[PDB]
């Protein structure tokens, strides 16, 4: 009882955060997966415009994070990651978002250096014949309007479930009265049919579509289409044997189909190097499965399984004859395939419940990765590695020990983990140069190998609930983009050390008054060049205060961010580079929520009450074609008002 808005999420069990994405969140998320991570300490976000941020976890970017949707993986097709994996995820339409920090699981795919992230839906539990609806409407500054409907009907034997949404916002303004190019629009409709013959069985087919557009204050091109499309089939059988607790089988298909241009939103910058109307279409076809058995007997729990994943990428672009001024749009030429990846793996995880206060946990997986370059030419010139292939075999695993204190309600844990990761599409194809003496990046960029120590504690008290997690680790053959002036990238392997932590606490002062706080630090050194790693988000703290009283509640929130002076100029990732140290800043916010009926909640909020003008260290450099000076990064929104209503029947 007693509703409120989510300003931070605490680490509830060791290494693991779990939150329900359907709750409101204090700086309102732009209906995008990265934004539902801001409220989890350790996550920072590279802003591209109004939405579609690239999420960074403990300084770690890109495929270093496994983002899953119903156990399945979905990748975008932009060579500059305009349509990052989270670009396609509306959390509101899911039922559970869960994060495991570190390389401390092997059940959910390969090369999870930084952490894995699992957006899930749960299958309906229908006894009688019956229905449930639940839905939300939101309304904010700058045209921000969102609709979300999730409904289902069924009985003991089966169910049908529709979930969908539509969301949009106009260009927002920063704290200096500047309209930031940041229009965006999204929608999504997925259905799920489920068959449950007995309670020990469940089969479930699911399909869905989504589209979206989004203007990008970074970039220099905009996203006029981000088509997504998904199939899925999952099998779950409980209590086969007395030791065979459950079997899981799961297949997934995920197609992405993006269109970027410089004329469907914005006008071609006449002084740029794209003064001509231009577009480029791109798509990514991902197919994959997973099969896993959970054995429980005596004091142990073994979870063996295998998984596989294939994915394919193609592109095609417009042409402009500038003496007819004729424009042949990119849908007239044929798709050129340029890359196919494969991966198969096997994994197990064993947990020993020694005594009732000690847990030992171990896991390994073996992954066989491979990739073939299909580019017959380059940007035209010859591609010296056309139709070439490569592969590798990448063992990864971990151990974690967790002890429960005798008296206080405290858990301690320490864990050691190794994770190897094959280069992703962007590390291999998107850079214009490889390492020195290499022909291109594809030929020589080495798989990245991470070894890291995690530890921390949980205090699950009465009035005081605290947690902390730290990490120290090294990174062999870290993959690192280096920028030279058009402007050109080079990908290299370097060695790195990393160190950091997160901690937080929430104290229930009196029966009405609650306060909480959080701290997030990351740190990275490039050992190869003796210098700092780029794109590391500075130290930040969050303070919350909350009054609750029966049916209603009111909140305040302080975000305070230190400056980042550890930077590597003209180095970074496929998306962005460092150039200047960042300023610190404070942002303050208010919120309230009210339970009208058993079925209708209300909430509202002011974000950035004092209309602070600020930008974040990780945000992209703004485009010269809009009013952006050299290297000036895209600013965060100024003051924004939002109200939101939540139904459930
Ligand atoms: Ag693009
Ligand atoms: Ag051009
Ligand atoms: Ag362009």
Numbering used by the authors: 66 to 444, 451 to 556, 560 to 723
Mind quoting what the paper says about this structure?
While OprCWT and most single alanine mutants can be (partly) loaded via Cu(II) incubation, this is not the case for the C143A mutant. We hypothesised that removal of the cysteine could lead to much lower affinity for Cu(II), so that after SEC, nothing remains bound. To provide support for this, we determined the crystal structures of the OprC C143A mutant cocrystallised with Cu(II) or silver Ag(I). For each crystal, datasets were collected at 8,800 eV and 9,175 eV to distinguish between both metals. Bound copper is expected to give a strong anomalous peak only at 9,175 eV (which is above the copper K edge at 8,979 eV), while bound silver will give comparable peaks at both energies (the silver L-III edge is at 3,351 eV). For C143A cocrystallised with Cu(II), no anomalous peaks are visible at both energies, showing that Cu(II) binding is indeed abolished. Crucially, in the presence of silver, the same 3 anomalous peaks are visible as for WT OprC (compare Fig 3A and 3D), strongly suggesting that the C143A mutant can still bind Cu(I). All 4 residues in the OprC binding site contribute to copper binding, but not to the same extent and, in some cases, not equally for both copper redox states. This is illustrated by Cys143, which is essential for high-affinity Cu(II) binding but dispensable for Cu(I).
